[PDB]
Amino acid sequence: NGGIDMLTELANFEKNVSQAIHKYNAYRKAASVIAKYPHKIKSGAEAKLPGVGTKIAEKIDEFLATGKLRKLEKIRQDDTSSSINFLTRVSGIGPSAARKFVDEGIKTLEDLRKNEDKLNHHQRIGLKYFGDFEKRIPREEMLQMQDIVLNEVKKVDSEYIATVCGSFRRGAESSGDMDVLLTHPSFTSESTKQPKLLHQVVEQLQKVHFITDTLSKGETKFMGVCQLPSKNDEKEYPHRRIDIRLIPKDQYYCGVLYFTGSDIFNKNMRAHALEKGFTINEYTIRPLTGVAGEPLPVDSEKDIFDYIQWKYREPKDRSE
DNA sequence: CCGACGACGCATCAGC
DNA sequence: GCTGATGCGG
DNA sequence: GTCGG
Ligand SMILES: Nc1ccn([C@H]2C[C@H](O)[C@@H](COP(=O)(O)OP(=O)(O)OP(=O)(O)O)O2)c(=O)n1
Ligand SMILES: [Ca+2]
Ligand SMILES: [Ca+2]
Ligand SMILES: [Cl-]
Ligand SMILES: [Cl-]
Ligand code: NA
User: Which of A82, A193, A213, A268 satisfies CB 3.0 to 4.6 Å to A186 for a cystine?
Assistant: First the structure.
């Protein structure tokens, strides 16, 4: 049901143009439930699955009959809408900044490059590598990036453990970018016994010229840019987005569940936890006046599934 | 009908 | 400077 | 935009 892409374009419109985040999540939920439905949908009535209601069923009926959606056709022709949608593809430009740029007449890639002085630091790096960040990463390259990260982390301190998460851990043949969960025994929910734990790793990866740029950096989260080294006379590899998350070592299982995703899977799982009277974040699962109690004991990813009475789903089956 | 929609880190800004 | 809200991101 | 109660 690849064509019924339609829902994704509608979601993107609502987020970027309408600034209607709940419509955006509604369409993405519908897109997700349809994407795992194992038959070729033949009518909106059939599609009207949890999260598909009347309005999306009507849109699906139009799309099946004609191959297009007039609502999208109008959105694709509208210059302001299409310009706002385009500017949000630069990392760091969201729907508010995109509309502000378009209001000032900044509407194309050319315009951004001419007006670089008007971008914050994140946006400037997102513009700089705009083309590269569009490309996906083949798993073969992800494997090499994994080896660099884990080996350099080991050189800093053999007690670190770095785990590559995201779509890579879900077994995807290509990834949007690299996600690294990092733990160290000196950083638990009970204490922080060593400072600079994330900084020293970031610094080492910069020192060997793997990390090339920083988008944001605090005590526990790094978001930046990296690049594989290339061989003599070879074209350079594209620059890649890299995220590193330092998680308390005793909260690894909640963190690797979060960082493995997908984002929709996490949303569904956490919503379901709420219905079961728990709340899950990347640190803890806590029972719910609806006030979170104390963290429940967790010794495995499966324990989190057990609490909310879901059967265990391996990462490869979490790609929603 | 209508409340409720996952959860949170870092950058930036207003107000102080 | 800090605090809280907002924007943007994973 | 959708849905449980
Ligand atoms: N709104 C979001 C976005 C992401 N994540 C979590 C689950 C994701 O799997 C992980 C990494 O986010 P990514 O944006 O890198 O996406 P993926 O790694 O899943 O896919 P890809 O990088 O291949 O596009 O962060 C989340 O919980 N909520
Ligand atoms: Ca991405
Ligand atoms: Ca990723
Ligand atoms: Cl269309
Ligand atoms: Cl917590
Ligand atoms: Na963006």
Answer: A193
